[PDB]
Write an enzyme that holds these catalytic residues in place. Structure first.
Site, PDB file in Angstrom:
ATOM      1  N   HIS B  61       0.840  -1.228   0.000  1.00  0.00           N
ATOM      2  CA  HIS B  61       0.000   0.000   0.000  1.00  0.00           C
ATOM      3  C   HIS B  61       0.861   1.258   0.000  1.00  0.00           C
ATOM      4  O   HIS B  61       0.449   2.269  -0.540  1.00  0.00           O
ATOM      5  CB  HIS B  61      -1.111   0.064   1.056  1.00  0.00           C
ATOM      6  N   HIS B  91       5.634   6.912   6.680  1.00  0.00           N
ATOM      7  CA  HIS B  91       5.298   6.531   5.307  1.00  0.00           C
ATOM      8  C   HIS B  91       4.708   7.754   4.622  1.00  0.00           C
ATOM      9  O   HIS B  91       4.448   8.771   5.262  1.00  0.00           O
ATOM     10  CB  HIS B  91       4.300   5.355   5.265  1.00  0.00           C
ATOM     11  N   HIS B  93       1.766   9.092   1.381  1.00  0.00           N
ATOM     12  CA  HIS B  93       0.675   8.892   0.419  1.00  0.00           C
ATOM     13  C   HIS B  93       0.948   9.859  -0.729  1.00  0.00           C
ATOM     14  O   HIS B  93       1.386  10.991  -0.472  1.00  0.00           O
ATOM     15  CB  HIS B  93      -0.700   9.190   1.051  1.00  0.00           C
ATOM     16  N   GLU B 103      -3.748  13.385   1.664  1.00  0.00           N
ATOM     17  CA  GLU B 103      -4.979  12.889   2.315  1.00  0.00           C
ATOM     18  C   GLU B 103      -5.738  14.063   2.921  1.00  0.00           C
ATOM     19  O   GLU B 103      -6.886  14.346   2.519  1.00  0.00           O
ATOM     20  CB  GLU B 103      -4.581  11.819   3.338  1.00  0.00           C
ATOM     21  N   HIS B 116       3.438  10.923   6.824  1.00  0.00           N
ATOM     22  CA  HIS B 116       2.870  10.574   8.139  1.00  0.00           C
ATOM     23  C   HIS B 116       3.956   9.974   9.013  1.00  0.00           C
ATOM     24  O   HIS B 116       4.439   8.872   8.692  1.00  0.00           O
ATOM     25  CB  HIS B 116       1.706   9.607   7.982  1.00  0.00           C
ATOM     26  N   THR B 195      -5.973   6.311   8.487  1.00  0.00           N
ATOM     27  CA  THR B 195      -6.538   6.561   7.143  1.00  0.00           C
ATOM     28  C   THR B 195      -6.530   5.324   6.252  1.00  0.00           C
ATOM     29  O   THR B 195      -6.964   5.416   5.102  1.00  0.00           O
ATOM     30  CB  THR B 195      -5.831   7.715   6.440  1.00  0.00           C
TER      31      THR B 195
HETATM   32 ZN   LIG Z   1      -0.689   7.520   6.370  1.00  0.00          ZN
END
Ligand SMILES: [Zn+2]
Lengths: 4, 257
Positions: B61, B91, B93, B103, B116, B195
């Site tokens: 992911h 990590h 996104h 996000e 994050h 999330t």
């Molecule tokens: Zn995250």
């Protein structure tokens, strides 16, 4: 979050 | 089998994780005019001098940079927090294009990516216990815009070729996460959730106002990662972000005027  | 595709993406998550439709889901849109300055909020204390990075993992992911969280080596405190939160992993996104990927949004603006830094409250002893508590986690969110390179990110970018596919990991020692912070620690804060599944409502979100700049070449390397395992058909790891969720009965507070 889960195991891990 | 959740993910970010047409068939298993965020709009499907509620079927296996009904808290997806809960009262304190993340991310949210940060309406900068409605956020209230809270003079009672303290400066954030980010204490990463003794951080011990261990490993980087493609988990299908995103990629996680993991830390030794067996002692108070890299901790977050102050700001809106009571007590001490240990860094476990960071990590990102990101998007398929520079106009999407974050996000959180700011007055509906989407950034190219969002970092994050995930921390757990030492009063609960381990991450698995912390995610069962409403004040279990503190996630420090940092927006990424495309412009100048971020020198402190390049060590991450350069290892990604070695973890291209789901389940690959590589040693990743002596990485200093201080090199990913912006100059200002001015922030917004609100109570929310993970999330990604299991979407647990255990997070105090701390979202920095100041983005970091990364180069087009740095984010292009994020987009060469794969969601798939080795010797499965290639699916580029892009658009691994959840959209903004309803704010419901929450207040976003600002640390700054
Ligand atoms: Zn995250």
């Amino acid at each position: 979050x889960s195991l891990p | 089998h959740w993910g970010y595709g047409k068939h298993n993406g965020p709009e499907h998550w509620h079927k296996d994780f009904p808290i997806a439709k809960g009262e304190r889901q993340s991310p949210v849109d940060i309406d900068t005019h409605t956020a209230k300055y809270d003079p009672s909020l303290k400066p954030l204390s980010v204490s990463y001098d003794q951080a011990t990075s261990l490993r980087i993992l493609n988990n299908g992911h995103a990629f996680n940079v993991e830390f030794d969280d067996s002692q108070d080596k890299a901790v977050l405190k102050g700001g809106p927090l009571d007590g001490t939160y240990r860094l476990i992993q960071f990590h990102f996104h990101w998007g398929s294009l520079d106009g999407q990927g974050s996000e959180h949004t700011v007055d509906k603006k989407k950034y190219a990516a969002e970092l994050h830094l995930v921390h757990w409250n030492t009063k609960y002893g381990d991450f698995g216990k912390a995610v069962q508590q409403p004040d279990g986690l503190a996630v420090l969110g940092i927006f990424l815009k495309v412009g100048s390179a971020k020198p402190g990110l390049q060590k991450v970018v350069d290892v990604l070729d070695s973890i291209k596919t789901k389940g690959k990991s590589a040693d990743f020692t002596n990485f200093d996460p201080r090199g990913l912070l912006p100059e200002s620690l001015d922030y917004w804060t609100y109570p929310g959730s993970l999330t990604t599944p299991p979407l647990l409502e255990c997070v105090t979100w701390i979202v920095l106002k100041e983005p970091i700049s990364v180069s087009s070449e740095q984010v292009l390397k994020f987009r060469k990662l794969n969601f798939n395992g080795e010797g499965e058909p290639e699916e580029l790891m892009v658009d691994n972000w959840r959209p903004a969720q309803p704010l419901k009965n929450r207040q976003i507070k600002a640390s700054f005027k």
